[PDB]
Amino acid sequence: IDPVVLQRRDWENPGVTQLNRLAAHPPFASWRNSEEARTDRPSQQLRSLNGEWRFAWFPAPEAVPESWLECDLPEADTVVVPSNWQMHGYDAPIYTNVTYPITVNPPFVPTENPTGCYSLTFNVDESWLQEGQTRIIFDGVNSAFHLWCNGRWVGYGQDSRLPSEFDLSAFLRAGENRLAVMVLRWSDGSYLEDQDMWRMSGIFRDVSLLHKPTTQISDFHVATRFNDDFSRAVLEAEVQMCGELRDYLRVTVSLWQGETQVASGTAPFGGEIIDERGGYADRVTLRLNVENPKLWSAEIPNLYRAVVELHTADGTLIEAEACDVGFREVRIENGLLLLNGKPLLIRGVNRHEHHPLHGQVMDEQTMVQDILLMKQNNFNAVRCSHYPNHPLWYTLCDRYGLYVVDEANIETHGMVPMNRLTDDPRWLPAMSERVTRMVQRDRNHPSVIIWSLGNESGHGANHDALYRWIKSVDPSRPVQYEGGGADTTATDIICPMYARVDEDQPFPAVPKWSIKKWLSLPGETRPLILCEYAHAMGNSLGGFAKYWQAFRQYPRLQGGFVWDWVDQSLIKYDENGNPWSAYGGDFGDTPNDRQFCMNGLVFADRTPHPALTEAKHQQQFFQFRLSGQTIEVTSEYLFRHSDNELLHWMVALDGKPLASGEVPLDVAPQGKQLIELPELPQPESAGQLWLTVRVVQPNATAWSEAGHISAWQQWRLAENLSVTLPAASHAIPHLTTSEMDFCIELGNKRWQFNRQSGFLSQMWIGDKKQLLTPLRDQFTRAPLDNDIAVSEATRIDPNAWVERWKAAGHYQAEAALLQCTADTLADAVLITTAHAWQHQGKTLFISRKTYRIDGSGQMAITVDVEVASDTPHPARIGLNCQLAQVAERVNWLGLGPQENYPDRLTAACFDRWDLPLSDMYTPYVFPSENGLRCGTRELNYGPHQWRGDFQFNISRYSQQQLMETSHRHLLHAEEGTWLNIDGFHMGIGGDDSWSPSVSAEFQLSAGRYHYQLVWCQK
Amino acid sequence: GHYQAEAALLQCTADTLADAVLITTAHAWQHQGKTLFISRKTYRIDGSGQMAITVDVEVASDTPHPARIGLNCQLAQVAERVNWLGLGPQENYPDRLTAACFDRWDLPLSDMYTPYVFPSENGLRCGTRELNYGPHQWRGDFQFNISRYSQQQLMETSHRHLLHAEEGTWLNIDGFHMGIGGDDSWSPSVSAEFQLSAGRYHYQLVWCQK
């Protein structure tokens, strides 16, 4: 194909971002019936061209044969559109984080430029061509394209994340027509699309045809302005037209509240005088008064319907357009972000448009599934990281109720320095279009409360210009932008990524201050909402509660957006057709950044990670205090009463329920309720009483089913310590001493301590061996993504926990025996052991133990550990062994039921839990230490019971296998069951995942540690 | 009832090992039917003359966190000097020990008492690994105070000038001690991290002759 199209190379020129593209505008449907517009029903004037298309792949646009313009290529395939062509296997998707997937040489792209040739033969009815305007709408094309209709060149478009529209009126004929779309993978637009995500291409959002009359609504803006107490509002609708102006033309704007018309107004065209040359003859603004409007919030998403009718004075409708209207005010005042006059607390998450099968194509089902899960887990806000979303997303957020940060498709992370392009006025045109056309599209959505200038593009003069452009065109929403230090002149909100709660990170030029400190820096007055925090990569969200404590305590700390919602894993199939989750590098893509695309609170199929429950608990909308027998409930709702809430309470003695009841909740927003519990029966047993409360929603909502639990909290009540001594045992265990073993016999039970190793190597119950691997101290864990601390494949931080561990010899050190002795007591055998772990003549740890086996068949293991002060703090201080048994169930008295770690255990509840063994393993795509449960007093597995105060995990996978396997699908069940029982376990961290992030209070730094376990048969 | 709690014996047994005698004890402290604390100990006396005291303490979760978890006795010996390896040389407490340095300190006994005009617990030194007083040596990882005044006398006396040296020397050796606070002096002011709230406590002392 040629000639001007190939010679001009528009995809290597940031001065050309489009040719012949129509102006951006809010969603249109061109209804010719007002009632269909009101009810938001399908429009005959809006056709989908989604479905089966013809497609051929080429290595470069030069390889595209001319004949393709005229007719179908025989070698083409029939494929579904929308789609990313990488998902159909035509070439590899690439995962890189920061480094561009192409040589950095702006505005040039590689000569080998994968080219997708899409075509469609389709019908157009004569009615559509006799009169009016027929346009084609490409909602998303990645990254740039030329368009032909029936062999004739139509135009060109850039920006993968906003719609490109072209007038086809002069190109079409009645009956059969053919479209030819040449999509280029790389363009100068790629320099503005360096988001930390899979790099794909193609026609990946809807394609549609829209018919508008020649005289048409071309744009409209809806604003809602309020009095001081929000009891009065004015809806202001500016309407623009194209076509010939006539005196008989009219616009009517009506506002609907369900079936009730609340207001209507009509005017001819002709705006007020704006300057010395007059006003806009082709515009009119309608003003409607609304008394006591029902206000829109995420809490209660009240919506009205505005209908915009273009018509003649005699009453003949030309066309109607429409939108949902949410009556809400967003403003920053005295340093606080307010919604309808009340300060928001953002329970937010970043959300990419990712599907493990369809790549970056978004469907309604997945969108709805995401929103439901978000709301069920107490999220009220979403950031569109890092591009305008599929248009349906905003409609759903409007109707379900979520606060939205709408973000321009501008990320230049890979530039050196980051602002090389954004400070260059030659790139201001390309940047402006990414901002301005976003605003023009999305400005009528009530769910959009904040505009964002993009992501990770430094701070340049181009940001300041566009910041001001938005502030000028839309004063209704704050503008934020994190680049260049998070608090620049281009942001209304201090919006850092991964600024910690208490700890400063004083990077040169772009420091990350403690969020508490940041607020009070000399002269600073703005609110702080983190654009990204609590990096949810694999086994993560350590310290999430620290953020939420601070958000609640500090008025100007107004929350943040977790990074992020969903793992960007992709599905591949093995030789047997079995699906597996894949990450960076698994497609032959290179260079790549491996698992760094998986940072989600949920797996790609939307199965929750364990971190999601911690998020739900910390983001609860009711706060609880206990005083005596009085529960104080405080509502953090700003607008709604608790009109779908009852409080269930339960008192239990070590898991055994003793008393329970329920009280309806009747709490005003920001209000308090006092609940006096009845007099509780005193227990005639030793142990700890535990109070658990939970908030239950009795009725189904749009986002939840009847019985949904929205909040919970636990307290210790009375404890009665056990003073009664167990009865003197009848049986007495016997000590047999050989050269190789200390053996202990009690009935048909046997304990065998290997005297060379100094470990318990075997146990027998009759003729059944109990151990496959001896019981040994363990001080290492299979490294979490946080311990590894890598964000770019070719970058290692020597301070990373795994790096320090490896270098200190933690994973290398082996036990050296210092002492192994045996003694007979009055009613017990006492085995005393001392070991040392060494690396290069350096003692890392010393473990001193006693094993006391008594007549009741209980083995009491007392362990005292020394950790050298100059060695890096160990991942854990515990024991492990491989059990011969494989049982169906795991039953424990401790924190659960889900996986919990010391810095991520607030959501867990103390109680008696019983799960299948498989649930005790968390299938993180990148395998690591997982499945731990803390605060555990009793553990039951098969014939075994362990008692003490410990943390444990239990599974068919050794720490050794977990640390040696890169992918979960490659793990194999080992013989029997691996048990890791820890006196102490280090935090998991997660403030970020590319530097040490475990807070000091969760590091194993005490130097000397003590724990005790009792092992017996159940 | 922390000041009134009475020690009730639960267990006291003796065992003879290969090279040691082992005494095992358990006690419960109770006030009006409520068990406040349980102390479980072993004393291991070997052929070298050393006595290893292992102490494990349970504290009821619903009793106010205790001021200390340790042992005390009145020694017959009155010596002139106190020698220790730990934080010093001056009085230091868990929430007030940043100024103290770890080293070998040697002071007159009188320097181990702080003469606050209103008498109270005083003269603690923390992070101590070895303590020497006359013929005795204690080793471990503990906090201690040492003086001629019992906690009882300090508690019962309003003015320092009314204190009288008791026979011998009162030794208070703690595995754990609560912070002193002071953010103000008219409400609870000891921060949570310096309160003895762990519920279960472990410490070991070795007592021998120097």
Ligand SMILES: *[C@@H]1C[C@@H](O)[C@@H](O)[C@@H](CO)O1
């Ligand atoms: C902030 C920006 C986002 O796109 C991700 O790169 C995240 C780390 O995974 O940091």
Ligand SMILES: [Mg+2]
């Ligand atoms: Mg271009």
Ligand SMILES: [Mg+2]
């Ligand atoms: Mg980035």
Ligand SMILES: [Mg+2]
């Ligand atoms: Mg809690």
Ligand code: NA
């Ligand atoms: Na706040």
Ligand code: NA
């Ligand atoms: Na990432």
Ligand code: NA
């Ligand atoms: Na209710």
Ligand code: NA
């Ligand atoms: Na691994």
Ligand code: NA
């Ligand atoms: Na006193």
